[PDB]
RNA sequence: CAACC
RNA sequence: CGCCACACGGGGUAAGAGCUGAACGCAUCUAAGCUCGAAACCCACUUGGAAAAGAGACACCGCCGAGGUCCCGCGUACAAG
RNA sequence: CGAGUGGCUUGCUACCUCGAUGUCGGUUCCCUCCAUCCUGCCCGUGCAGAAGCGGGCAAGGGUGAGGUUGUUCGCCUAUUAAAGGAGGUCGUGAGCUGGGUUUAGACCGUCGUGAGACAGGUCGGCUGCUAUCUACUGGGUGUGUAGGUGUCUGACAAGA
RNA sequence: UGUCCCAACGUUGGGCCCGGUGAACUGUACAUUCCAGUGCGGAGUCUGGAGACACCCAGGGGGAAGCGAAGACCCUAUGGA
RNA sequence: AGCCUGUGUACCAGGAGGGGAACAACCCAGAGAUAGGUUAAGGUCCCCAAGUGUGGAUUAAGUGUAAUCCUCUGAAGGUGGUCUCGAGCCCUAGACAGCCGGGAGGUGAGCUUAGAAGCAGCUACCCUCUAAGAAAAGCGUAACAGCUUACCGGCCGAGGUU
């Protein structure tokens, strides 16, 4: 993928339950996995900012519950680092459905996004309140 | 179904023995384009500290933007070229033919060696060239030594010594650039080999660690579980199956870790200077402070502070020069916090 | 079932059907192809396939050598060509296969299979100068679905 | 470096096997043996083959060690080796009265042993030390 | 056996070892014949490929010698010369020689340039569409013209529908 | 699959 | 869990693509010869390595004194050593 | 239909061991094989392209995480370039585990007049030892080469 | 929630060195082994090669079909209960 | 099956010594002690005692350098790799191959068909010119065209073909 434009050490996991932040219906979405990794012996597969995932939908509405989905991850707590050196971190570890073609499947995010995930989805972006 | 994985540590860097020499000893040396010159160059590692950096790589999104970089502050007084020694080409290898040394010795050189206070310059050279008209002459090293006394936070005042070799322009041509050197007094500078932005493989002895177990040595796993409480916590399985009946080398083990001589390639030189700039405040932990000629490694350079660590134009660099990055800040603020 | 199990002579001759009971029949469809109504007389050529070691062939093995042979010459020369082939073995020797360990081992009756001694012809073609090459060929096709090597020996023929 | 030799024998284009026997036995007798330019002795075959036997040797080993020589130097010395019986007192002796060299470090030429010779112009199908350490990846010192 | 290969007059064969060379006004070629039990030499006006042997192995290198020889005469007076022309359907392929290599560019569109080096003293020129291989050598003229068309191999896609490509027209 | 069936 | 560094390029091949080429006047990538061609082989690079018994090389110092040991203060080292 | 190769399964034999060579699966750690799943380079195509399908060279490297089940295997899920197979006493209990198997308690079904039986099921159920030799990982003292200091060479050896 | 990803640092007692005290297990012999082979088919000792200068310290236990217990399974005995 | 179970015999068991790398029963050999000599099996490039023996031929794969065998594999099938022997036929009245030239008219046969002209299918398959040249052997075309095989001549010159 496109540099993301930061450091990131990854603050989630297969099975990591994570805020949906959007208006899809979705409350709380489950990582299942990771695009694009593949990890080694043992290790328990992981994503951070910035990653598309798959996910189940563990809250949310009855329509919704249970689905399989695309999204990508636009906070997490675990610090990330800015070519300036500055480490950034957010209130809690959240992802925005996403379609086939990257497109957010919901109407409006809710709460803030890391500016790098813009780079990479823009369309994404151009759905976003807040940009930090 | 028993999931394939690499194996725990690489079987290159081996054996895991502390190293002979503590003054690091190249094995390669950079190919004959340029002019004539020293191959390398030698210097104390100090510590560390950060630096903002304009972006230089003219292919980065990032270009001309604030870069913060790890520095890793090495003192390089001016070292002293003592001597001019010749290789052979024989059946049997490269063989040191003759050396040619010089008068006007560092005050201490002779905590080290025995100084000449006899010796032939003239008989010497006239043996080399002789060599170069025959075809047998090898490559051309100098002897070469360091003036720990101009460093005021080591210790120690013996100087060390190493032999760094001399490529360049044609034999006869280096060969000539070589005698001018040792001369002299053989005093050269960092200036003079490197110049900011350029890459240079740095090679030095690591920090020591004593006796560890397979897990620090080697990158074993813990044992995990109900198997971590039975009385086996940081042993690997097996020393290996019923057969062979033996027990491979390859098999990770307890031993000696740290203290072995590591080379490390491309390493960027970000700024040659002299001065206390890079100094940082309450002085450089266990170290002390910085004011005089100095260079700035990015990132890290193997071994204690302290330790000699030796720098070569890089043997197979990655990416072209892009000389005298723009330096526009240079942490000083306390390493102790 | 491999043919590695039967092909040699390792055992004594079993044939009688007085004191042997549930013999397979043969996959043997025919003895004799060709024009049978015609004499071998009435052609120049007679060509044989010389068995070069001695063998048991089982009656699957001569079924199809003889179909992948006759086969060939009635795609060469007509459902009703002008030739007559002949098979001249039969299966006679009763085949066994042990299938409790080595007790009371004497195998159930399984197949059939015709002793073969080397040098002698298991096949026999008559044919017009023409076809004669046809049968060279349908032989080739049938020695590569029996055990030993063969000879393809040609008889009355000095048209070459 | 000065080897009172008793003979000084050339291996230019020579048998290496038929050379080596021979010098066993002149070593086993008492005789002080100089093999010279070793990188030109000669293994006939084909190539291919050879290589492969040889490349073997260098891959063979493991921790109690399996230590090949690469270069025609010691090729030869082991194919000598070899012949005699190296492990006992009197073998020990002949064999360390047997040195092979690169190229020809004395003043006389070697003497051309009967039998060993082989003739350029009747054969194609043969390869030299020199080839093959190559090959194996020495450093071509000679 | 024995073969008698009368030199022409354009021509003047010297032969020492194993190796032979032939000159004429067209260059010179130097080559080496070596076979078990095969003696080449220059025996006054006329060149002598002689064996005791007579095996099928043997008389196959005699034959090939011979050839090799005529055509080494052939190639310091006549020369050798190979035609090719090059043909390309969408993008405008370019063909050049810059220094000892003939480079081309653009094939099929793509951005490196593919380039082979010419072999021995064969010169190559190119005119328009048309290009022409020659020199005394024919082992170096022959190669050269090959490595011209291999260099423009394709294996990825269907040939029948990407032809472009250099092609030798005239083989001498 | 680690004896008896 | 943080940070840094870890090629390109040569040489010889396999499968394969070809050149010249005869046995076999032709043809033929092959029989002799040759041009190419794999993450694979060799080199490049890193690490160990005078106990390599052919047990190595060079320079200087010293043989009434070069150098070294004990001793003392200590760690860039360390389970004893 | 015919001819073979392997020694991963099963069967057969009873050669070795009953003054004992600990028994499945897993785990951990090391080496290997190629009949190649991916990666490199090729050939063919019912090859336009993209992508398939089949074939060749090739063992350098990789071949992962999860749900049921003691399971091996297998079925299933989301990832992946691919999530290949096999040997090393079915590598590995003087390394681990103890779910299964495999005593003594108990129950069910079936069998037995009964005692009691069941690679049928089910709940519970113990794992000793201070390493002599050898092997290897690292660390020293001596001798040999034959006064000392410093600097090297590079036969060999290891690497993905 | 360190069971796990994936391991880190620290604490106390040992471990290591020194004074003193001071056992046991085990021992046909020889014994520096490694790769293959052979052999009653599962060899440090036989054969062929390879490797191997002696001694000592620490270690985790690959091998000695390691030590400990005349197999408790299975069968056999004109055995026992 | 280094399996089970018979039979005759010699061997191991209870049999040394020599050979077979090692190797109860495969080879020589049956053996008091000691000594000289000559052989057996087996072997004679070195390790290791004796040949780098002689005449000759084949093999290029390191095939092979392996009597026997749990132990030494190598099969059906294939081979213009190479060596040797034989048979038929053709050839200096010029063979086989190659290259050049010619390959023609009635007529694009008749039939079928809108059409088919060597070559969709069916039938017939005749004679002129001539040194040859099919009512056409293989491609090719919507059908022609076009490219070639047969067949004839030339150049060349020695064995060629089955
Ligand atoms: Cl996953
Ligand atoms: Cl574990
Ligand atoms: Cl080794
Ligand atoms: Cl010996
Ligand atoms: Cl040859
Ligand atoms: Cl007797
Ligand atoms: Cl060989
Ligand atoms: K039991
Ligand atoms: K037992
Ligand atoms: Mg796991
Ligand atoms: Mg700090
Ligand atoms: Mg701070
Ligand atoms: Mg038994
Ligand atoms: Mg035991
Ligand atoms: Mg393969
Ligand atoms: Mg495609
Ligand atoms: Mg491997
Ligand atoms: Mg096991
Ligand atoms: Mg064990
Ligand atoms: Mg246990
Ligand atoms: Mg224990
Ligand atoms: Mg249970
Ligand atoms: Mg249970
Ligand atoms: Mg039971
Ligand atoms: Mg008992
Ligand atoms: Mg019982
Ligand atoms: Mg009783
Ligand atoms: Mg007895
Ligand atoms: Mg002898
Ligand atoms: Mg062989
Ligand atoms: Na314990
Ligand atoms: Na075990
Ligand atoms: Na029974
Ligand atoms: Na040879
Ligand atoms: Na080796
Ligand atoms: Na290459
Ligand atoms: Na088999
Ligand atoms: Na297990
Ligand atoms: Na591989
Ligand atoms: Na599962
Ligand atoms: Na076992
Ligand atoms: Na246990
Ligand atoms: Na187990
Ligand atoms: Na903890
Ligand atoms: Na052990
Ligand atoms: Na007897
Ligand atoms: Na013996
Ligand atoms: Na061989
Ligand atoms: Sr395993
Ligand atoms: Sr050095
Ligand atoms: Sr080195
Ligand atoms: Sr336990
Ligand atoms: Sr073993
Ligand atoms: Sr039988
Ligand atoms: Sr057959
Ligand atoms: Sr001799
Ligand atoms: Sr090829
Ligand atoms: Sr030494
Ligand atoms: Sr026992
Ligand atoms: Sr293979
Ligand atoms: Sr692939
Ligand atoms: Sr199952
Ligand atoms: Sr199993
Ligand atoms: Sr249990
Ligand atoms: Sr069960
Ligand atoms: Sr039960
Ligand atoms: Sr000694
Ligand atoms: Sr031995
Ligand atoms: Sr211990
Ligand atoms: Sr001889
Ligand atoms: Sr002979
Ligand atoms: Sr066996
Ligand atoms: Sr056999
Ligand atoms: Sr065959």
Redesign the interface.
């Known amino acids: 993928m496109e540099?993301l434009?930061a450091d990131v050490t990854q603050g989630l996991e297969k099975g990591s339950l994570i805020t949906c932040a959007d208006n899809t219906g979705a409350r709380e979405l489950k990582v299942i996995s990771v695009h694009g990794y593949s990890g080694?012996?043992?290790r328990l597969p992981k994503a951070g900012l910035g990653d598309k995932i798959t996910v189940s939908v563990t809250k949310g509405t009855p329509e919704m519950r249970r689905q399989v989905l695309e999204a990508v991850v636009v906070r997490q707590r675990k610090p990330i680092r800015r070519?300036?050196?500055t480490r950034v971190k957010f209130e809690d570890n959240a992802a925005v459905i996403v379609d086939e073609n990257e497109d957010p499947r919901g109407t409006e995010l809710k709460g803030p996004i890391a500016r790098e995930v813009a780079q990479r989805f823009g369309s994404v972006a151009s759905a976003a309140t807040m940009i930090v | 179904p028993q999931?394939?994985?690499?194996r725990k540590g690489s079987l290159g860097f081996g054996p895991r023995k502390r190293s002979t020499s503590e003054t690091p000893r190249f094995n390669s040396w950079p190919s004959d384009d340029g002019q004539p010159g020293v191959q390398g160059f030698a210097g104390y590692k100090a510590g560390m500290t950060?630096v903002?950096l304009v972006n230089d790589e003219p292919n980065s999104?990032?270009e001309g933007?604030?870069?913060?970089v790890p520095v890793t502050v090495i003192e390089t007084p001016p070292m002293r070229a003592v001597a001019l020694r010749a290789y052979e080409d024989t059946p049997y290898g490269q063989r040191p033919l003759t050396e040619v040394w010089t008068d006007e010795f560092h005050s201490e050189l002779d905590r080290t060696l025995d100084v000449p206070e006899d010796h032939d310059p003239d008989a010497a050279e006239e043996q080399i060239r002789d060599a170069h008209e025959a075809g047998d002459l090898g490559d051309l090293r100098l002897i070469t030594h360091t003036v720990p006394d101009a460093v005021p936070s080591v210790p120690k005042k013996k100087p060390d010594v190493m032999e760094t070799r001399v490529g360049g322009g044609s034999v006869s041509d280096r060969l000539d650039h070589a005698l001018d050197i040792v001369e002299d007094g053989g005093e050269h500078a960092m200036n003079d080999i490197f110049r900011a932005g350029e890459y240079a493989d740095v090679a030095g002895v690591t920090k020591g660690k004593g006796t560890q177990g397979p897990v620090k040595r080697w990158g074993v796993?813990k044992r995990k579980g109900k198997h971590a409480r039975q009385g086996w916590r940081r042993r690997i399985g097996n020393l290996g199956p019923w057969n062979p009946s033996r027990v491979r080398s390859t098999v990770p083990q307890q031993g000696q870790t740290g203290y072995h001589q590591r080379t490390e390639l491309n390493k960027r030189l970000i700024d040659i200077g002299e001065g206390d700039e890079p100094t940082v405040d309450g002085g450089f932990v266990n170290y002390g402070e910085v004011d005089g000629p100095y260079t700035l490694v990015k990132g890290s350079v193997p071994g204690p502070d302290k330790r000699l660590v030796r720098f070569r134009p890089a043997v197979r660099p990655n990416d072209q020069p892009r000389l005298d990055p723009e330096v526009r800040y240079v942490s000083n603020e306390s390493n102790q916090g | 079932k491999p043919a590695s199990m039967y092909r040699d002579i390792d055992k004594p001759a079993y044939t009688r059907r007085e004191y042997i009971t549930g013999i397979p029949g043969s996959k043997i469809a025919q003895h004799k192809m060709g024009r049978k109504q015609k004499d071998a007389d009435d052609y120049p050529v007679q060509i044989s396939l010389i068995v070069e070691e001695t063998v048991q062939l089982r009656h699957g093995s001569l079924e199809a050598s003889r179909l992948s042979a006759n086969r060939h010459l009635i795609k060469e020369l007509g459902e009703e060509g002008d030739y007559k082939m002949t098979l001249r073995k039969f299966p006679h020797q009763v085949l066994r296969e042990n299938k409790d360990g080595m007790r009371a081992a004497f195998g159930k009756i399984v197949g059939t299979a015709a002793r073969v001694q080397a040098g002698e012809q298991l096949f026999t073609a008559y044919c017009n100068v023409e076809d004669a090459e046809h049968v060279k060929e349908a032989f080739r096709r049938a020695y590569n679905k029996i055990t030993p090597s063969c000879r393809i020996d040609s008889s009355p023929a000095g048209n070459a | 470096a000065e080897f009172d030799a008793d003979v000084i024998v050339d291996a230019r284009d020579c048998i290496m096997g038929r050379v080596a026997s021979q010098v066993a036995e002149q070593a086993l007798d008492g005789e002080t043996v100089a093999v010279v330019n070793a990188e030109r002795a000669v293994i006939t075959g084909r190539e291919e083959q050879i290589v492969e036997k040889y490349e073997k040797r260098v891959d063979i080993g493991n921790d109690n060690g399996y230590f090949y020589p690469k270069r025609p130097d010691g090729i030869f010395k082991r194919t000598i080796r070899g012949m005699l019986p190296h492990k006992k007192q009197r073998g020990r002796e002949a064999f360390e009265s047997v040195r092979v060299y690169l190229g020809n470090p004395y003043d006389e030429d070697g003497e051309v042993l009967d039998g060993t010779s082989l003739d350029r112009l009747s054969n194609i199908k043969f390869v030299t030390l020199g080839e093959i350490s190559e090959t194996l990846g020495a450093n071509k010192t000679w | 056996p024995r073969v008698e290969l009368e030199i022409p007059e354009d021509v003047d064969a010297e032969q020492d070892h194993l190796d032979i060379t032939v000159e004429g006004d067209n260059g010179s070629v130097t080559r080496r014949l070596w076979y078990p039990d095969i003696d080449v030499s220059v025996d006054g006006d006329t060149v002598v490929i002689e064996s005791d042997e007579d095996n099928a192995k043997t008389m196959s290198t005699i034959g090939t010698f011979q050839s090799h020889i005529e055509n080494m005469f052939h190639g310091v007076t006549e020369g050798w010369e190979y035609g090719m022309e090059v043909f390309y359907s969408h993008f405008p392929m370019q063909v050049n020689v810059e220094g000892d290599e003939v480079v081309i560019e653009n094939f099929l569109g793509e951005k490196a340039p593919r380039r082979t080096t010419i072999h021995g003293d064969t010169d190559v020129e190119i005119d328009g569409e048309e290009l022409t291989v020659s020199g005394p050598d024919i082992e170096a003229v022959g190669q050269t013209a090959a490595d011209i068309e291999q260099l423009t191999r394709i294996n990825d896609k269907d040939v029948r529908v990407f032809q472009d490509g250099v092609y030798i027209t005239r083989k001498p």
Do not use: F, I, L
């Not at chain 2, 999931?3 to 690499?6: A, E, K, V």
């Open positions: 540099a434009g080694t012996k043992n070519p300036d050196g | 999931p394939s994985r690499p950060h903002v999104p990032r933007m604030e870069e913060t796993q």
